[PDB]
């Protein structure tokens, strides 16, 4: 288990938490093995390219592995996963000077099936997690990649169900924004 996001300023450093391997992946790209550490004897092993970037210093008291990134650049913005072959959830590091902003979350109601949506606008940094009815509704859901506009992200999601079951059987869009520790559960209501 690792945190969802970390908005580190350019030049600043960041201490990320978790045989503990570490993999880097820039959104939309492939993966790079950064290095395997060993809590048993604090036996850290680095990839040359990162040897000077990260430090796999563990912790017996917390019983958690760590990796630190010093003086970050937008080239460091990426997903960092800490795998044991147990893959962690990864932390999305966003090396930017911009500040955190929680999303506004708006219900998208219309006007044999019906389509409702959720618009998540004006947040920074990424990511956001979106589910419908806390995950109970998954079959007719589409979630669109966020698009960066004026230093802010906007995302949307649609869900389609049998027309006779809405609004009779409630539908709520759940959005979590890790960077701001905020969540919004917006019920879709008839206009």
């Amino acid at each position: 288990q690792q945190p969802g996001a970390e908005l580190v300023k350019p030049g600043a450093s960041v201490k990320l938490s978790c045989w503990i391997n570490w993999v880097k992946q820039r959104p939309g790209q492939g993966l790079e093995w950064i290095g395997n550490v060993y809590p048993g004897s604090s036996s850290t092993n680095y990839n040359e390219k990162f040897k000077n970037k990260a430090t796999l210093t563990v912790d017996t008291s917390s019983s958690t592995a760590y990796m630190q990134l010093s003086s970050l650049t937008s080239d460091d913005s990426a997903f960092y996963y800490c795998v044991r072959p147990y893959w962690g959830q990864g932390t999305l590091v966003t090396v930017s000077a911009a500040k955190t902003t929680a999303p506004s979350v708006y219900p998208l109601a219309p006007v044999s099936s019906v389509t409702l949506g959720c618009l998540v606008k004006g947040y920074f940094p990424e990511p956001v997690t979106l589910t419908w009815n806390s995950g109970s509704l998954s079959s007719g859901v589409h979630t669109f990649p966020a698009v960066l506009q004026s230093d802010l992200y906007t995302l949307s999601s649609s869900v389609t169900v049998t027309s006779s079951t809405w609004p009779s059987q409630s539908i709520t869009c759940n959005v979590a924004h890790p960077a701001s520790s905020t969540k919004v559960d917006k019920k879709i209501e008839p206009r």
Partner: protein, 218 residues
């Protein structure tokens, strides 16, 4: 360090058909201990990779017996028999024989299915966004195939091209279709000075567009 190569960045396949993703290492991954240290992973949009095969040919626990890896000491082949929509994603090969471990470039599996026209839905700004002075009009073009699609917005009969944000999903793991969202953002001041708002989708499946509109005064 060892260089892992996957000649194909993508490979199509008919649902229910077999396919093979090839990969190669610049060095032999067959360790004297008799084990060929090569892994295979599948990565789905927004999900951490997941092992499918380990030690060159061992099927991972929980993994269906449809996947299996074979290959010499430097040439590997992942085969998927009777592919399912659920298999779309990007497949990687990895060597962990020597440090530093290295990955192939990934081969995206693309399912080829029957063409389908998009279902278009248009949504006016919510009352909440309007209270805050913004006015986003959203149009969803869902479950179409092939991937290419064009959207055109009109306001009071005139085409509008600025203020539009478009986003596409990766291929659907349930039905192998694509979907696209198009959002026209105006300020409330402007949104309140026009009446007609129109979303037009033009897709391969037809030379006639699918049009959805609403009138703010309707």
């Amino acid at each position: 360090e060892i260089v892992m190569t996957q000649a194909a960045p993508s490979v199509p396949v008919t649902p229910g058909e077999s396919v093979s993703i090839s990969c190669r290492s610049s060095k032999s991954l067959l360790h004297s201990n008799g084990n060929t240290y090569l892994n295979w992973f599948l990565q789905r949009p927004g999900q951490s990779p997941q092992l499918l095969i380990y030690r060159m040919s061992n099927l991972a626990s929980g993994v269906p017996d449809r996947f299996s890896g074979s290959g010499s000491e430097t040439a590997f082949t992942l085969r998927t028999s009777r592919v399912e929509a659920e298999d779309v994603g990007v497949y990687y090969c990895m060597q962990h024989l020597e440090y530093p471990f290295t990955f192939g470039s990934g081969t995206k599996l693309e399912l080829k299915r029957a063409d389908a026209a998009p279902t278009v839905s248009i949504f006016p700004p919510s009352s909440e966004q309007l209270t805050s002075g913004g006015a986003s009009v959203v149009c969803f073009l869902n479950n179409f195939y092939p991937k290419d699609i064009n959207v055109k917005w009109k306001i009071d009969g005139s085409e509008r091209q600025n203020g539009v944000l478009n986003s596409w999903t990766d291929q659907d793991s349930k039905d192998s279709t694509y979907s696209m969202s198009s959002t026209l953002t105006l300020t409330k001041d402007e949104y309140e000075r026009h009446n007609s708002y129109t979303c037009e989708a033009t897709h391969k499946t037809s030379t006639s567009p699918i049009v959805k509109s609403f009138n703010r005064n309707e």
